[PDB]
Symmetry: C3
Subunit: 215 residues, 3 copies
């Protein structure tokens, strides 16, 4: 009838306005400024000591929203042509906090999702190459890169680069990316299992905490 | 004697020989020596100044075969395990001219297609590792690398490496490669959309110029 | 009982794994990790090509009929786990393989995770290994030997011109997927895939014909 297609894009737009109003009106456990300031506070000492102190601070300020020491493990992350490792501390459907970094020189595509991802370097260097330009920037400990919603860059990390990462938005929209290189390159399905496990642990902790505070 | 198998073999051989004869007896808008000399002439300037001057020269010598300024945009190129960026100026089924390069350190497979691809460096370095050897060669501004037909090499580019590229042959035979990393790694389908858009704009410009000559 | 069928599948997989593991534990092998490691470190002070030739000659002398001749040796590109190198296969069976590996460009990525132990003795260059579960990597130089253990997955990195002698023992088919992924979902270099299939078929047929010659 020459009209049906306008109704499908209108239904997707209704869904998008619904989700956008929800994400703009929702309450969040953390904010990117809090995580960025906490990470920049310990940017002067060793990155492992910084990891420990930031974990302690996050468990103190937000009890029931951070995994315990028995649930912390380093999991390899192969995505977008790069390879690093993560230690997940918090994860819901709209938020995640983790410690990211690499001990090797890597780089590739940063991904493009419906979420905002901030990274505060604890040690090393962080080269970001934004879209549409011919020049990149290097960020140092204390600085923070804000991978905006819907924008795609090229990331490059030198050996020994470690940072604290906070993401807010629609978290599932990232999942595919985080697994792509594992499905079509590394074939390390044990790491896939580890990732699914730690994500499930964080989600279950968050759900049980929501159950407890309601009653 | 199996008849359908022999017929398939003979038909595919006749099709390949037909395409080969058409490529051997076809007229072309550019040649690799033209693009290479034009790029080497301006290789001593800043690569952005060189970009401007090379675009102006290409539009002067070949009017109606280069996209206008409102249609030029930098689109990411993830392929063969490396990540760079392109600005497509011309593209047909048998030719393409573009500005390629990266602002990060990358490298990977060069691909292996039925087309000859020449790259003249305006800035940076270009490490080529030919097939069947244990040593590579570094190339500097002014040099021209010819990725030959059916040949596969290893490419590596340092941060800030920019070059002018001309490809001639059966251009569609590259498409799969050019999209592989996008489908199974980056999942950046908006960059895929940009690539499809610019390639379609170039093909439409070429068909429009073909129509303008006849009437 | 649907649980009966799933338990049957689990028990069958378990008995097959146990059968293959017992066979690997009770099998005789042509080479060992220490042999290849010491032989490569012996020539690790020369240029990597002179070392290549000397190691090939010594290996063909000590184990005749188990290593390809000069007419079957060729360099084949190897894209895997996000890194790109080159290999020259000298020996390969279902449980063993010996080859020369290395890269002329700076590369790195996932090391893979298979049911086989893979040793690499550096003849030239540098080898950065990043073990799983740690936040620090380690660089190894010519003369050193890296042991990619069974079931472990690391991050590998090699600088331009790094060359080594590789020996793998275990269930070699368990590597096939990792060896082909980048070719299927990235490089599309099916001619390099053909070359890989060709050299491995040559090696397998060499092993089979050598075993037939022993019996008659
Ligand atoms: O842990 C990650 O990767 C950080 C690396 N950074 C690099 C810079 O760009 C953003 C991602 C991601 C994750 C993995 C698993 C659970 C939750 C999140 C976060 C989104 C990006 C890929 C996967
Ligand atoms: O834009 C590109 O990439 C140049 C980079 N070069 C670097 C040297 O080796 C060949 C590729 C390609 C393209 C393909 C199709 C349309 C428009 C552009 C050209 C072929 C290689 C990948 C895709
Ligand atoms: O020949 C290879 O490539 C060695 C590369 N090495 C480098 C050091 O780390 C381990 C892998 C492999 C292969 C290629 C082709 C067919 C069957 C196997 C052997 C298993 C490990 C990867 C792929
Ligand atoms: C990636 C971690 C740092 C590696 C050493 C880089 C030293 C400076 O490198 C420079 O960085 C600039 C911004 O990216 C670019 O303009 C230059 O092309 C690049 O040479």
């Amino acid at each position: 009838l020459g009209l049906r297609a306008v109704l499908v894009v209108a239904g997707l737009a209704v869904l998008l306005q619904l989700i956008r109003g929800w994400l703009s009106s929702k309450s969040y456990v953390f904010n990117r400024e809090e995580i960025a300031r906490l990470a920049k506070e310990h940017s002067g000492l060793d990155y492992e000591v910084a990891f420990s102190k930031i974990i302690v601070e996050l468990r103190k300020k937000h009890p029931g929203h951070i995994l315990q020491d028995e649930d912390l493990q380093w999991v390899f992350v192969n995505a977008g042509g790069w390879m690093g490792s993560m230690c997940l501390l918090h994860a819901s459907l709209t938020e995640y906090v983790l410690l990211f970094g690499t001990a090797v020189d890597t780089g590739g595509h940063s991904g493009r999702y419906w979420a905002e991802i901030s990274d505060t370097i604890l040690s090393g260097t962080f080269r970001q190459w934004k879209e549409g330009t011919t020049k990149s920037e290097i960020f140092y400990p204390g600085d923070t890169i804000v991978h905006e919603v819907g924008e795609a860059t090229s990331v490059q990390w030198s050996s020994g680069t470690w940072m604290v990462e906070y993401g807010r938005g629609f978290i599932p929209s990232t999942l595919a990316f985080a697994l792509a290189d594992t499905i079509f390159s590394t074939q390390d399905f044990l790491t896939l299992f580890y990732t699914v496990k730690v994500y499930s642990k964080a989600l279950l902790l968050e759900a049980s905490t929501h159950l407890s505070q309601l009653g």
